[PDB]
Design an enzyme around this catalytic site. Structure first.
Site, mmCIF file in Angstrom:
data_model
loop_
_atom_site.group_PDB
_atom_site.id
_atom_site.type_symbol
_atom_site.label_atom_id
_atom_site.label_comp_id
_atom_site.label_asym_id
_atom_site.label_seq_id
_atom_site.Cartn_x
_atom_site.Cartn_y
_atom_site.Cartn_z
ATOM 1 N N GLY A 2 -5.134 0.142 2.483
ATOM 2 C CA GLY A 2 -5.775 -0.537 3.601
ATOM 3 C C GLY A 2 -6.400 -1.887 3.281
ATOM 4 O O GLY A 2 -5.946 -2.585 2.385
ATOM 5 N N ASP B 256 1.590 1.321 -6.087
ATOM 6 C CA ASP B 256 2.473 0.172 -6.279
ATOM 7 C C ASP B 256 1.592 -1.056 -6.541
ATOM 8 O O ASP B 256 0.409 -0.912 -6.866
ATOM 9 C CB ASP B 256 3.315 -0.065 -5.029
ATOM 10 C CG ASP B 256 2.468 -0.319 -3.804
ATOM 11 O OD1 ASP B 256 1.492 0.428 -3.600
ATOM 12 O OD2 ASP B 256 2.772 -1.252 -3.035
ATOM 13 N N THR C 95 0.822 -1.242 0.000
ATOM 14 C CA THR C 95 0.000 0.000 0.000
ATOM 15 C C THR C 95 0.856 1.294 0.000
ATOM 16 O O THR C 95 1.582 1.580 0.951
ATOM 17 C CB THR C 95 -1.054 0.014 1.228
ATOM 18 O OG1 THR C 95 -0.424 -0.355 2.471
ATOM 19 C CG2 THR C 95 -2.231 -0.945 0.951
ATOM 20 N N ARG D 266 1.678 -4.473 -4.433
ATOM 21 C CA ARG D 266 2.171 -5.482 -3.505
ATOM 22 C C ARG D 266 1.208 -5.629 -2.324
ATOM 23 O O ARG D 266 1.080 -4.722 -1.499
ATOM 24 C CB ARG D 266 3.548 -5.053 -3.012
ATOM 25 C CG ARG D 266 4.397 -6.116 -2.361
ATOM 26 C CD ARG D 266 5.587 -5.448 -1.674
ATOM 27 N NE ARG D 266 6.765 -6.307 -1.577
ATOM 28 C CZ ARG D 266 7.921 -5.937 -1.028
ATOM 29 N NH1 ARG D 266 8.058 -4.718 -0.524
ATOM 30 N NH2 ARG D 266 8.938 -6.784 -0.972
ATOM 31 N N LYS E 170 -4.167 -1.666 -7.331
ATOM 32 C CA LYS E 170 -4.911 -0.769 -6.451
ATOM 33 C C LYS E 170 -5.798 0.251 -7.187
ATOM 34 O O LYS E 170 -6.634 0.928 -6.575
ATOM 35 C CB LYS E 170 -3.933 -0.022 -5.531
ATOM 36 C CG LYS E 170 -3.243 -0.866 -4.452
ATOM 37 C CD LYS E 170 -2.170 -1.786 -5.008
ATOM 38 C CE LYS E 170 -1.410 -2.508 -3.887
ATOM 39 N NZ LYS E 170 -0.715 -1.568 -2.944
ATOM 40 N N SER F 262 5.263 -2.167 0.887
ATOM 41 C CA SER F 262 5.021 -1.737 -0.488
ATOM 42 C C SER F 262 6.239 -1.985 -1.374
ATOM 43 O O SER F 262 7.381 -1.809 -0.942
ATOM 44 C CB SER F 262 4.698 -0.248 -0.510
ATOM 45 O OG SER F 262 5.789 0.482 0.026
ATOM 46 N N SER G 105 0.911 2.707 3.503
ATOM 47 C CA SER G 105 2.037 2.378 4.370
ATOM 48 C C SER G 105 3.208 3.340 4.188
ATOM 49 O O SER G 105 3.854 3.748 5.158
ATOM 50 C CB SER G 105 2.507 0.960 4.071
ATOM 51 O OG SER G 105 3.792 0.742 4.612
ATOM 52 N N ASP H 135 9.946 1.603 2.132
ATOM 53 C CA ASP H 135 8.900 0.968 2.912
ATOM 54 C C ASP H 135 8.890 -0.538 2.648
ATOM 55 O O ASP H 135 9.195 -1.004 1.535
ATOM 56 C CB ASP H 135 7.542 1.585 2.550
ATOM 57 C CG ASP H 135 6.384 0.997 3.349
ATOM 58 O OD1 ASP H 135 6.387 1.116 4.596
ATOM 59 O OD2 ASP H 135 5.464 0.424 2.728
#
EC number: 3.4.25.1
Lengths: 222, 204, 222, 233, 212, 198, 78, 198, 204, 222
Positions: free
Chosen positions: J47, J17, J1, J19, J33, J169, J129, J166
Site C-alpha cells: 500500500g 518484490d 506490492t 517495484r 518492502k 509488482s 496487488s 500482476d
C-alpha cells in the site's frame, strides 16, 4: 440528514390602539396535514404589563418567551423591582435573538403594550433581531390575508371622500377597543375560510392601564 | 423563478343581481423591472369575457387562440358561443397540452343570453374547472384576494355597489403584492350595456 | 381529498368531501369529487384534480359509445378495464387515484384504482388525504350486510372523520347511491356541518369611495 | 445528526373524569425485521406517573436510566421523598423537555416522541407530548407515529372537546383505546399484536396492565375477495 | 430597497424608501432604513435588516466610549473604520450589509464612507445601494452639482428615490429625508410615495406614459 | 448583454445599438451593426445569443420581403411585429429556441404615425414610447421617465438619447464601444453617422 | 458583601430548580446549598471564611420554614 | 480583475493601476488609488478580493513603518518583498487566506538601483523587469517583450506604458476607467497626475 | 488543476565515476502564461545539492526552511551535514506535514566528503525516500524523463560525458512538455570544483 | 506490492518484490518492502509507501526504548499491539497494510494488520496487488511443517507468481529468515529473474554536441 426545524402553522396579530393594545393568535397547532391540539396558547403575559407571542417553530417560540420572562425577572433583581419600559424590552429581545444570529430562532415574535406616555405600542421582530415599532402587524401563516384587510379598514387605504374625486383621502379616526376586536374577529374568520392552517379558536389579550384582559371566541374546526 | 410569476398580475370576478364584474391590474414587468402599465389582461368574444394571468407570452397566445376559435364557432352555428359552452372549451383546450402547459390561470365571466343568469369561472394551468356563485381570483397576489373577497363580498350587490366592492378588493391586494399594480381597469357586465373604468392607484 | 365507498345488499354507496386545496390555500369551497361514468356507474376522484375529472370524462364517453353499439347496459368491470389500462400506459404521470362503483345486469361492484394502474377490491375503500382517518371509522364500525340507511350512515360518518381531523379536506359531504333494479340518487350535500357564522360588520362602501380616471361604454356585436 | 436503528411505533393516550390512559405495544422493529418483543415502552416513574416512549430504542433505554437516577436523586436529603415533596408528572416532563431541546440545539438529538401521563398531587390530569425537536403540546388525546393519524380520530369521537373529560367513565375510555389498538394492528406493518396498557386514576392510583392482545377481529369476509376485478373463481 | 446619500456645499443629504419584502409579498411599508447612530452620525440600511440595525447601534455605543475618553468628537473615518473592522472579523460567517456612514466633523468637513460585509470601505461623494440603485443613480448623476441649494439638494434626493420606487418592484412606500450638518442631522419628514408621485407628475410634467 | 435602445418621438423612431462584439476574453470588433431593415419603413434591432441572433433576423427579413413583392404592398409595423411575436412564440417550445430579443420601429404610412414594438425571446410583445432590452433599462428608464414628451422633435430625441448613453458609460461595467443610431420616418431609414462622427 | 455573594448564589439555585424542573426550591435544600458553599472556604488555602450570618424564611410544600446559617456551614432549622 | 502594471527602467520603477471599483452591476467609484507607500522609497500596488485587498496592504505598511522608526534605518526593497512573501505564504495555509496579488517597486539607495518584485496570493515571488497581475498580462506582455530595453529613460517608459494601456482599452471587455501612474526613485515617490490630466 | 502542475518545471540527477550532475529548466508560469525564465530550482547547503519541483511558493519556502536548518546544524556539530544525513531530514521534514503537504518533489544529490562516493535521491510529497545508482527525475515532464534516462544513461560516465548525457535528456523532455522550458542550467559536482552551465534551447 | 509470509519449525520467513508504482509508471526498480522493527522482528509493507516505512520506523524506535527499559528481548505481540492501536486511532487515513513477523523468547509469530487496525493470524499470509496470485500458490502447495528450505522455496515461489501475473509488482525478490536461537538473515535479492537485456546501440554523444551559453565555477564554504 437531521433537520432541526419545523413549522407548527399558527397566526398571531397585534394592533396598537390610541391608549391600549391587543395581540391575538389562534389556538390550533399542527404538523404537516395533521392536528396536535385544538387549544394550545401562543400569547402570554410576561409581567410588567407586556404581552408577547413568538410564532413559527413551536419549540423556538417557547424557548424565547421562557428566556425573555426569566429575563424580566432579573431586570427587577438588579434595578430595584423597577418596571420594564416596553421599549427597553424590545431592545433586550433584540440581543436575545441576535444572540443566536448563526443558529437563528425560526420564529416571528411580537410584543405589545403601553409606552411611557400611556399610548398603545406594538413591536414586530425579525427572526434574527430586526425590530420596528409597528402600529398594526399580522405575522404568521395567513398574515398575507389579513394585512390587506386592515390596510383597508384600520388605515382606510384606497378610500376617498365621495364627490371630491381622487382628491380627498378619507380621514382616519381611532377605533375603540370594541371596534378593534370586531375587526380582529372578522379577519380571523375569513382567514379560516381560506387557509387550512388556521382555525379552531382565537384567544385575545388586551393591554390597558389596569392590567391584561383575555377573551376567547371559537373558530371553525375545518 | 416559477414561470407563473416572472411577469406578474392579478384578475378577479364577482356576481351580483343580474350582472358580473371582472377586474385586473395593468402591470407587465420582467422580475423586478417594471416594463409596462398598459398591459390589459381582460378580453372578450361576443358577450363572453375572459381574463388571463401568468406568463405574458401565453396570455397573448391564448387570446388569439380563443378569438380565432370563437369566430369559427359563430360562423358555423350562426350564433355567438355562451359562457358555459365556452368554459368547457378553454378547459379542454388547456388540457390538450397537459404535458407542456401554457403557464396561466384563466377566468371566464359573462351573462347567458338565454337564461339571463350571471356566470363566473376559474381554471388552473391544466384546465381543471371551477364554478362559484361568489368570486374568482387568480394571480400573484392570489392570497391577498381570497382575504379581501372573503370579507367584502356580499350576495346580490347592485351593479353600482358591486363596482365598489370589487374595486376595493383588487386595489388593496395589488398594494400588498410587489409584482402587481401600475393601474387597474374594471368592467360591469349587464344583460345589455357594459361599462368600463380605469382606477387611480399608487404608481409604485 | 377524502373519499370512501361501501356496498350493501342491493347496491353500493360512495361519498367525498368538497374541498380542493392548492398549497395551504383553499380554492373551491364546494367542489364535486363524484363523477358519472354512466347512469349507474360512478367515480370518486382523489389526487390531481384536472386528471381525474378528465379521465372519467373520457372513459365515460367511450363506454356510452360501447353500450349503444353492443345494445346492453354498461358492465362495471369494463369501466375498470378501461381506466387501469389507460392509467398504466402513462406510468403514473396522470395522477388520478379513484373509487369506481356501480351496478350492471350482473350485480353490484366496487373497485379502487391507483395512479399507476393497480386495482384492488373489497367491500369498503378509502382514498385521499384523510384515508387513515376514515379508515378507523371503517375498521371499527363495519359488519357484513348493512341496511341501505346503515351503509349510507357509515360512509357519511367516515367522510366526516376526514373533514374534522385532516387539513387537506373539509366543508360538506356529497353522496351517490346506486341500488339494483332502481335508478341512482345523487345527493349533492347530504350534509352541511360547516357554515361560516355571520360577520360582525357590514363591509359595503358608500358609492363614490373608489377614485376613477376614465369611463366609457364598450360594444359587442357588429 | 444520526439515524434511528431499532424502533418502537405508536403510543396512544387519553383523559377521563378521574384520570388518564396510555397504551403501546411491545415490538421493537429493526427496519422491516421484527427482531424483538420483550420490549417495554411504558416506563412508570414514582407512583403517579408513566412515560410512553417511541422511536430509537437505544435512546429510550438512555432516558429510562436518566429517569431512574432522577428518582434515586430526589430522595437524597429529603424526608418527604414519598409524600409532600415527591416527583410530579409536571416535574418529570419539564425536566425531560429541557434535555430534549438542549440536545437538538447541539445537533445531536434523541430520536424520540414522548408522552408523560399522570395525575398531579392535587388531583389534576396531566397529558403532554414532546418529540426530538423539543416541540411540546397538551391535549385531551395524544399519540405518536400513526396514532396521530389513525388513533386520534377515534379517541376524539369520544372526547371531542375539553368539555367532555368530566363525563368520560374510566371504563368507556379504555374500551375505545383498545378498539383503537385493534385498528393500529389492522393497518400498520410496524406494529405488534400484544401490548401494555397503564391507567392512572386519582382515586385507585396506578394500574399497570401488562401483556394482553387484540381479540374480536373480522377476517371472515376475506373468503369473498377473489382476484381484482375479473377473476370470478 | 433604494438608499442613497451625497455630499455638497450644504453638507450631506440622505434619502431612503421604506419597503421590506418577503418573496413577492410586501411584509411592510414602514421601515426605518436610517439608523440614527448618534446626534452626529447616520448609517443607512441595505443588505441585511438585522445586521445593519444591530451593529450600527453597537457602533454608536463605541463612539460614546471614545468621546468620553478623549473629550472630543469621534471622526467619521475612525467610526467607519471601527465598523468595517468588526465586520471584517466575521468575513465568511455570512453577514450581509451595504451601508453609508455619514458625518460632518470640524476638521474633515462632510464625509460619506460606504461600508459593506465584504470588508470594503470606500470614501466618496455619491453612493446608491439597493435594488433600485441603478435608477436612483440616473436622476442623481445628471442633476448633481456641488453648489446645490439646501432646498433643492433635498428635492433631488427625494425625486431620486421616487424614480426607483416607480420602476423597481422591490422599492416603494414613503421616502425619509435627513440633512447632515456640522452641528448634527435634521430630519426632514416622511413622504408617502403614493401621494408624491401624482404631485410630481402634475407639477413637473414628467411621467408622461402614466395616465392619471 | 448588448445594448438596445429605442425611442418614438413626434414623427419617427430612433434606434440605438452598441457596436462591440466580444468572444470571451477579446473584442473581435467595435463596429458591428445590430440592425437589419425589413422593409422601406420598418427597422429591427436585436441582441441575444451568439449564433441565434442574426440567423433569426435574416429569416424574418426574408419572410417580410417575400410577402412584399408577392403582394406588391408593404406590410404594416403592427402586422410585422405581430408576425415576429408569432415565430418567437412557437420558438420557445421547440427542440431548441432562438434566444433573441428585439425592437421594431417602423413608420405607418397609413396612419402617418411612428410605432415602436419591443419583443423578448419568450414571445412577450408590447407597444411602447421607448424601450430597451436586458440590463440596458435600469440605467436609462428613469432619465426617460423624466424628460420624454410625445411632442418631441427628432432633433430633441437625439439629444435625449445622448444623455442615456452618457449615463450607460459612467455606470456600466462593460465597455460597449459606443452605439450606432438610425432614424425611421415618412421618408424611410437613414443613419445618424454623426453621433459616431462626434 | 459576603451576604450579597451568598444571597446571590441562592437566587441562582432557585432559578435553576424553577426553569428546568418547574418546582419551587424547598427551604431545607437551600440550607444544604448554603452550607456546602460556605464549606469550601474552611478547607482550602489562600482564602477566608464568609463573615456573615443569615436567617432564611420561606414557604414550600411543608408550609412555613425558618433557618439559621453560620459561616462555618452550620445551618439549623429553628 | 483589476489592472496592475509595473515596469523598471534605467533608474526608477513605474506603477500603473486602474481606477475603477465595481460592486456587481454598478461602479461605485472611478478614482480609486490601489497604491500604498510602505516607506520613502518602496511603493506597493495591489488587486484582489474585495475586503482582503486593503486590510492586508495597510497591515504590511504598518509593519514596515514600525520597523523603520525602531531601527531608524530603512528596510530594503529586496527584504521588504521578502517579508511580504512570508506573510502571504503563511496566509495560504490558514483558516481563511487573503486573496491578494501585489507589486512592490522600490529604490535601493544602497546599490542605487531600482527593483521590482511581483508576488501573487500563493506566496509566489519573482524579480522582474516588468510585470502584471491577472488577465492584465496577455494584452501587454508581447508589446513589452518587443520594445523594452534596460537603458530606457523614465521618460521613455511612460511612453511605452501608454501603449500597453491603449491596447488594454481596445481589446479588454471591462472598462477599467483609466489608470493612475506613480514613479519611485532616488528622490522618492511622486504621481504622474498628467497621464490622467491628458 | 493539480496543485503540482500550475507552475510547472523539471529536475533530473545522475551519477558517474566520482561525480554527480543535477539539472533543471528555468520556467515559472501560471497555467499557460509564462511568467519567468530565470526561476532556478536548484539550491545548495555546503556541498549538498537539492533541486525541487512543484508548487513554486512551496519550492521557495522549502529552500528557506532547509537553509535555516542546515546553518543551525553546522553551528551545532561544527561541520556541514552530509548527503545521507540530509536526505533523512528533508524526508522527516516533508512528513511532519502529512495532512497538509507541501506540493513538491525534491531531489538530493551530492558527494560524501568522508567516503567520497556519489549520491542522488528522490522523494514524493509526503516524504517517501528513494535511492538509485543511476538517475532521478521529477516534475511535469516526469515521464518524458524516464524515457530519456532509460536510454541515454550509462554507468560510470566521465564528468565530461555525463554533462552531455544529462543535458540531452533534460533538453528533449522539456521540448515534449508544454509547461517546461525557457532555458536550463546543469551542474557537474566533483569532490572539489563545481562547474555550472546554462544551455541554449527553444524559447517556445 | 506483493508480499507474503510463512512460518515453519524454528522460525518464519517473509518475502516481497521490489517495484514501486505511481500510476502506470515505475518509480523504484529496486525498492525494499522489508523493514526491521527490532533485530528479530521484521515487517513487510504493502500500500501507501511513505506510510508503512514511517510507521514501522516509529514503532521500532519505541520498542527499542521499551526492551532497554524492561531489560528483555522484544516480544512480537507488543510490536503488534502498538501498530494496530496506532493504525486505528487514525481511522484508516494512514494506509499501511502489512505483515509483521518475528521471534521472541516465547516462540515464533506471524501477523497481518490492515489499514484500519484490524489484525489476523494464520500460518501463511499475502498482502498487496498480487495477493490473489500468490495465494493460489499457497492454497495449493501448502502443508503443515515445512523444512527451512521448503518454507523459503514456497515463499519465494509465491512472490514470483505475483511478479509475472500482476502489473502492480515485479523485478526482484527480497527475503528475511528469522530462526529461533539464531540471528536473522537478510537476503536482499534472493533472486533476480529480471535483468534488462543489453541495448542495441551505444547512445553516448560526442563531446560538444550540447550548446552552452555560460559557464563558471561556483563556491561552497566561507
Amino acid at each position: 440528514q437531521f433537520n432541526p426545524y419545523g413549522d407548527n402553522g399558527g397566526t398571531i396579530l397585534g394592533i396598537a390602539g390610541e391608549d391600549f393594545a391587543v395581540l391575538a393568535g389562534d389556538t390550533r397547532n399542527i404538523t404537516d396535514y395533521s392536528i396536535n391540539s385544538r387549544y394550545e396558547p401562543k400569547v402570554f403575559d410576561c409581567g410588567d404589563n407586556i404581552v408577547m407571542s413568538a410564532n413559527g417553530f413551536a419549540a423556538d417560540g417557547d424557548a424565547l418567551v421562557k428566556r425573555f420572562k426569566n429575563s424580566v425577572k432579573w431586570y427587577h433583581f438588579d434595578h430595584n423591582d423597577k418596571k420594564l419600559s416596553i421599549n427597553s424590552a424590545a431592545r433586550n429581545i433584540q440581543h436575545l435573538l441576535y444572540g443566536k444570529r448563526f443558529f437563528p430562532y425560526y420564529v416571528h415574535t411580537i410584543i405589545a403594550g403601553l409606552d411611557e406616555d400611556g399610548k398603545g405600542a406594538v413591536y414586530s421582530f425579525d427572526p434574527v433581531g430586526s425590530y420596528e415599532r409597528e402600529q398594526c402587524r399580522a405575522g404568521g401563516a395567513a398574515a398575507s390575508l389579513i394585512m390587506p384587510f386592515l390596510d383597508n379598514q384600520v388605515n382606510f387605504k384606497n378610500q376617498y371622500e365621495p364627490g371630491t374625486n381622487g382628491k380627498v383621502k378619507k380621514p382616519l379616526k381611532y377605533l375603540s377597543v370594541e371596534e378593534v376586536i370586531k375587526l380582529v374577529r372578522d379577519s380571523f374568520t375569513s382567514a379560516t375560510e381560506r387557509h387550512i392552517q388556521v382555525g379552531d379558536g382565537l384567544e385575545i389579550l388586551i393591554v390597558t392601564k389596569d392590567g391584561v384582559r383575555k377573551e376567547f371566541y371559537e373558530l371553525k374546526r375545518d | 423563478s416559477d414561470p407563473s410569476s416572472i411577469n406578474g398580475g392579478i384578475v378577479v370576478a364577482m356576481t351580483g343581481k343580474d350582472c358580473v364584474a371582472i377586474a385586473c391590474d395593468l402591470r407587465l414587468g420582467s422580475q423586478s423591472l417594471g416594463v409596462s402599465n398598459k398591459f390589459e389582461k381582460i378580453f372578450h368574444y361576443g358577450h363572453v369575457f375572459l381574463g388571463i394571468t401568468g406568463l405574458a407570452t401565453d396570455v397573448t397566445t391564448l387570446n388569439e387562440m380563443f378569438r380565432y376559435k370563437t369566430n369559427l364557432y359563430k360562423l358555423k352555428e350562426e350564433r355567438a358561443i355562451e359562457p358555459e359552452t365556452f368554459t368547457q372549451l378553454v378547459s379542454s383546450s388547456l388540457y390538450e397540452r397537459r404535458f407542456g402547459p401554457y403557464f396561466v390561470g384563466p377566468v371566464v365571466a359573462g351573462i347567458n343570453s338565454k337564461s339571463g343568469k350571471p356566470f363566473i369561472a376559474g381554471f388552473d394551468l391544466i384546465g381543471c374547472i371551477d364554478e362559484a356563485k361568489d368570486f374568482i381570483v387568480s394571480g400573484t397576489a392570489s392570497d391577498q384576494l381570497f382575504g379581501m373577497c372573503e370579507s367584502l363580498y356580499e350576495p346580490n350587490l347592485e351593479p353600482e355597489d358591486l363596482f365598489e366592492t370589487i374595486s376595493q378588493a383588487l386595489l388593496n391586494a395589488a398594494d400588498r403584492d410587489a409584482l402587481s399594480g401600475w393601474g387597474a381597469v374594471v368592467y360591469i357586465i349587464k344583460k345589455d350595456e357594459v361599462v368600463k373604468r380605469y382606477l387611480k392607484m399608487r404608481q409604485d | 381529498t377524502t373519499i370512501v365507498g361501501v356496498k350493501f345488499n342491493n347496491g353500493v354507496v360512495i361519498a367525498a368531501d368538497t374541498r380542493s386545496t392548492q398549497g395551504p390555500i383553499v380554492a373551491d369551497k364546494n367542489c364535486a369529487k363524484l363523477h358519472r361514468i354512466s347512469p349507474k356507474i360512478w367515480c370518486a376522484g382523489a389526487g390531481t384534480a384536472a386528471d381525474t375529472e378528465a379521465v372519467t370524462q373520457l372513459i365515460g364517453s367511450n363506454i356510452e359509445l360501447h353500450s349503444l353499439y353492443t345494445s346492453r347496459e354498461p358492465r362495471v368491470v369494463s369501466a375498470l378495464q378501461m381506466l387501469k389500462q389507460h392509467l398504466f400506459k402513462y406510468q403514473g404521470h396522470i395522477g388520478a387515484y379513484l373509487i369506481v362503483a356501480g351496478v350492471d345486469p350482473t350485480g353490484s361492484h366496487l373497485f379502487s384504482i391507483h395512479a399507476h394502474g393497480s386495482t384492488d377490491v373489497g367491500y369498503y375503500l378509502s382514498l385521499g388525504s384523510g384515508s387513515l382517518a376514515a379508515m378507523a371509522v371503517l375498521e371499527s364500525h363495519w359488519k357484513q350486510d348493512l341496511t341501505k340507511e346503515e351503509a349510507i350512515k357509515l360512509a357519511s360518518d367516515a367522510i366526516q372523520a376526514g373533514i374534522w381531523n385532516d387539513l387537506g379536506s373539509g366543508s360538506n359531504v356529497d353522496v351517490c347511491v346506486m341500488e339494483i333494479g332502481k335508478d341512482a340518487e345523487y345527493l349533492r350535500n347530504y350534509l352541511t356541518p360547516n357554515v361560516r357564522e355571520e360577520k360582525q360588520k357590514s363591509y359595503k362602501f358608500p358609492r363614490g369611495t373608489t377614485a376613477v380616471l376614465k369611463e366609457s361604454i364598450v360594444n359587442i356585436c357588429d | 445528526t444520526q439515524q434511528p436503528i431499532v424502533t418502537g411505533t405508536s403510543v396512544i393516550s387519553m383523559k377521563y373524569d378521574n384520570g388518564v390512559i396510555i397504551a403501546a405495544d411491545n415490538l421493537g422493529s429493526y427496519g422491516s425485521l421484527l427482531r424483538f418483543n420483550g420490549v417495554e415502552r411504558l416506563i412508570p416513574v414514582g407512583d403517579n406517573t408513566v412515560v410512553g416512549i417511541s422511536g430509537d430504542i437505544s435512546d429510550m433505554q438512555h432516558i429510562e436510566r436518566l429517569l431512574k437516577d432522577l428518582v434515586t436523586e430526589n430522595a437524597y436529603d429529603n424526608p418527604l421523598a414519598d409524600a409532600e415533596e415527591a416527583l410530579e408528572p409536571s416535574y418529570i416532563f419539564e425536566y425531560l423537555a429541557t434535555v430534549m431541546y438542549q440536545r437538538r440545539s447541539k445537533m445531536n438529538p434523541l430520536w424520540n416522541a414522548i408522552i408523560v401521563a399522570g395525575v398531579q398531587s392535587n388531583g389534576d390530569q396531566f397529558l403532554r407530548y414532546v418529540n426530538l425537536l423539543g416541540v411540546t403540546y397538551s391535549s385531551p388525546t395524544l399519540a405518536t407515529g400513526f396514532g396521530a393519524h389513525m388513533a386520534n380520530p377515534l379517541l376524539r369521537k369520544v372526547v371531542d372537546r375539553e368539555s367532555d373529560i368530566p363525563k368520560t367513565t374510566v371504563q368507556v375510555a379504555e374500551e375505545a383505546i383498545v378498539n383503537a389498538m385493534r385498528v393500529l394492528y389492522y393497518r400498520d406493518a410496524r406494529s405488534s399484536r400484544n401490548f401494555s396498557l397503564a391507567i392512572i386514576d386519582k382515586n385507585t392510583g396506578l394500574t399497570f396492565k401488562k401483556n394482553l392482545q387484540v381479540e374480536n377481529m373480522k377476517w371472515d369476509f376475506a373468503k369473498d375477495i377473489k382476484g381484482y376485478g375479473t377473476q370470478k373463481i | 430597497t433604494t438608499t442613497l446619500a451625497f455630499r455638497f456645499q450644504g453638507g450631506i443629504i440622505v434619502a431612503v424608501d421604506s419597503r421590506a419584502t418577503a418573496g413577492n409579498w410586501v411584509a411592510s411599508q414602514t421601515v426605518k432604513r436610517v439608523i440614527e447612530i448618534n446626534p452626529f452620525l447616520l448609517g443607512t440600511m441595505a443588505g441585511g435588516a438585522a445586521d445593519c440595525q444591530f451593529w450600527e447601534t453597537w457602533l454608536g455605543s463605541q463612539c460614546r466610549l471614545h468621546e468620553l475618553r478623549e473629550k472630543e468628537r469621534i471622526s467619521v473615518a475612525a467610526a467607519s473604520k471601527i465598523l468595517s473592522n468588526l465586520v471584517y472579523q466575521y468575513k465568511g460567517a455570512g453577514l450581509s450589509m451595504g451601508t453609508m456612514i455619514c458625518g460632518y466633523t470640524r476638521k474633515e468637513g462632510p464625509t460619506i464612507y460606504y461600508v459593506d460585509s465584504d470588508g470594503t470601505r470606500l470614501k466618496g461623494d455619491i453612493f446608491c445601494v439597493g435594488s433600485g440603485q441603478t435608477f436612483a443613480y440616473g436622476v442623481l448623476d445628471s442633476n448633481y452639482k456641488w453648489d446645490l441649494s439646501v432646498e433643492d439638494a433635498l428635492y433631488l434626493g427625494k425625486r431620486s428615490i421616487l424614480a426607483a420606487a416607480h420602476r423597481d418592484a422591490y422599492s416603494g412606500g414613503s421616502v425619509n429625508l435627513y440633512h447632515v450638518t456640522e452641528d448634527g442631522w435634521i430630519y426632514h419628514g416622511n413622504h408617502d410615495v403614493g401621494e408624491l408621485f401624482w404631485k410630481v407628475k402634475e407639477e413637473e410634467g414628467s411621467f408622461n406614459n402614466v395616465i392619471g | 448583454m448588448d445594448i438596445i435602445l429605442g425611442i418614438r418621438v413626434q414623427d419617427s423612431v430612433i434606434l440605438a445599438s452598441s457596436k462591440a462584439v466580444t468572444r470571451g476574453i477579446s473584442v473581435l470588433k467595435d463596429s458591428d451593426d445590430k440592425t437589419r431593415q425589413l422593409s422601406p419603413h420598418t427597422l429591427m434591432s436585436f441582441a441575444g445569443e451568439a449564433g441565434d441572433t442574426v440567423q433569426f433576423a435574416e429569416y424574418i427579413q426574408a419572410n417580410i420581403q417575400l410577402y412584399s413583392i408577392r403582394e406588391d404592398y408593404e406590410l404594416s409595423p403592427q402586422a410585422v411585429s405581430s408576425f415576429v411575436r408569432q415565430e418567437l412564440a412557437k420558438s420557445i417550445r421547440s427542440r431548441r429556441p432562438y434566444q433573441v430579443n428585439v425592437l421594431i420601429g417602423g413608420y405607418d404610412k397609413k396612419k402617418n404615425k411612428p410605432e415602436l414594438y419591443q419583443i423578448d425571446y419568450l414571445g412577450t410583445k408590447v407597444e411602447l414610447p421607448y424601450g430597451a432590452h436586458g440590463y440596458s433599462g435600469f440605467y436609462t428608464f428613469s432619465l426617460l421617465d423624466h424628460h420624454y414628451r410625445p411632442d418631441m422633435t427628432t432633433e430633441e430625441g437625439l439629444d435625449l438619447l445622448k444623455l442615456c448613453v452618457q449615463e450607460l458609460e459612467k455606470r456600466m461595467p462593460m465597455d460597449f464601444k459606443g452605439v450606432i443610431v438610425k432614424i425611421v420616418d415618412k421618408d424611410g431609414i437613414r443613419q445618424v453617422d454623426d453621433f459616431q462622427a462626434q | 458583601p459576603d451576604a450579597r455573594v451568598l444571597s446571590n448564589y441562592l437566587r441562582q439555585q432557585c432559578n435553576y430548580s424553577s426553569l428546568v424542573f418547574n418546582r419551587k426550591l424547598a427551604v431545607e435544600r437551600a440550607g444544604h446549598l448554603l452550607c456546602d458553599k460556605a464549606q469550601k472556604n474552611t478547607q482550602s488555602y489562600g482564602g477566608r471564611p464568609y463573615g456573615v450570618g443569615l436567617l432564611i424564611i420561606g414557604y414550600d410544600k411543608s408550609g412555613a420554614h425558618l433557618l439559621e446559617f453560620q459561616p462555618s456551614g452550620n445551618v439549623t432549622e429553628l
